[PDB]
């Protein structure tokens, strides 16, 4: 897409904040100044974090942008980014962007940051198998199936999501830095073959068991597994319970809505040293 004749900035970039960003990038004096296509072709980087941008309409006319910093705006749609064929680095933290499929043709994209966007569905990222860095912290993701295709990732953050099933990571042996804190992970076996890890974070899991019936003498199998499948010993057990491997046991003369236990296990994978820590909650049916 091109502007055939020089046109005022504010006619191309409908968002007042983004028009000012373009003006400043080009060292123009006002958003009413005319811009040429050649001037737009010369934009290779935009830094516009925390700028109150609600839309990047008009950015489609910037074919050569390689780095886009748009953290902390009010974006809800990234359709105008879809044909930015040279984009290599994209930062979109703290927006509300969910149309990840809009990125599918960005085949030079190496780094993508989408933290705190309210994302659940990441299936559109399947179209970016060349990605080297992916940051999806602080979202509401449960299903990371498609990440089994992202075999060029060396850095991946999924911290602070709702993930229990990390099997899709098992084959991603290029991973070096892997951030998985604050999920629902109880089973590390998917990580066992990640021999190139240097950084691994496994803090503060919440592992939620399927409800079972309350009984006065409760017996709950421990399902927390290390990378070799061995059971991780609980360190702290609620309600005066005790561990008799492989079961946690409680005497509950009165109904209570849940019992729980907490575990902590140092783990080494590759060169990475991690602390796998979590709470298992067992809800009880009265």
């Amino acid at each position, epitope marked *: 897409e091109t502007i055939t004749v020089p046109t005022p900035i504010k006619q191309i970039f409908s968002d007042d904040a983004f028009a000012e960003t373009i003006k400043d990038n080009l060292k123009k004096k006002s958003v009413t100044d005319a811009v040429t296509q050649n001037e737009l072709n010369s934009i290779d980087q935009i*830094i516009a974090n925390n700028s109150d941008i609600k839309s990047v309409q008009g950015i489609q006319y910037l074919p050569n942008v390689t*780095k886009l*910093f748009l*953290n902390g705006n009010k974006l809800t749609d990234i359709k105008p980014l879809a044909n930015l064929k040279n984009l290599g*680095w994209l*930062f979109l933290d703290e927006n509300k962007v969910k149309d990840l499929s809009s990125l599918k043709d960005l085949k030079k994209l190496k*780094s993508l*940051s989408l933290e705190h966007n309210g994302i659940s569905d990441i299936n559109g990222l399947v179209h970016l198998p060349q990605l*080297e*860095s992916l*940051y999806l912290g602080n979202n509401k993701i449960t299903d990371i199936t498609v990440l089994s295709r992202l075999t060029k990732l*060396d*850095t991946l*953050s999924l911290e602070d999501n709702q993930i229990s099933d990390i099997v899709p990571l098992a084959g991603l042996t290029k991973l*070096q*830095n892997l951030y998985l*804190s604050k999920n629902h992970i109880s089973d590390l076996r998917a990580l066992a073959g990640l021999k190139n890890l*240097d*950084v691994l*974070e496994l*803090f503060s899991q919440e592992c939620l068991n399927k409800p079972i019936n309350h009984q006065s003498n409760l017996v709950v199998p421990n399902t927390v597994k290390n990378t070799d499948g061995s059971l991780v010993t609980p360190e702290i057990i609620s309600d005066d319970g005790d561990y008799e491997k492989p079961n946690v046991k409680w005497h509950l003369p009165e109904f209570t809505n849940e019992v729980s236990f907490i575990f902590y296990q140092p783990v080494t994978i590759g*060169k*990475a040293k991690a602390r796998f820590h979590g709470r298992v909650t067992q809800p009880l049916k009265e």
Partner: nanobody
Amino acid sequence: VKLEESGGGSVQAGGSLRLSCAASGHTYSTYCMGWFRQVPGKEREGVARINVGGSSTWYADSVRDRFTISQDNAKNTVYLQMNSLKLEDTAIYYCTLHRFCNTWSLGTLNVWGQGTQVTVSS
């Protein structure tokens, strides 16, 4: 996040200097820390980094065999040993940090220290 810089100074070409940088306040469990350098007016450039809490390092092509970066993870401090210093190494060296090393390399999103003068003379 606050970065405290130490070291630097002036030394004759071929000599050695050391730089230190300590991170304090609200540090992540692991993070990227190291230095960029800049001659006044000229473009800043990455020098060396290390993943504090891991082990991976990176060096600019021009320093790769003369400089060594290390960490004291317990002190949240990194160290740069600068050997065989050249006139071209004269610059202000800025400690700088980002949670993720691949982003650290860009500079743009980093936390920055105030800068330490390094001067190499003939």
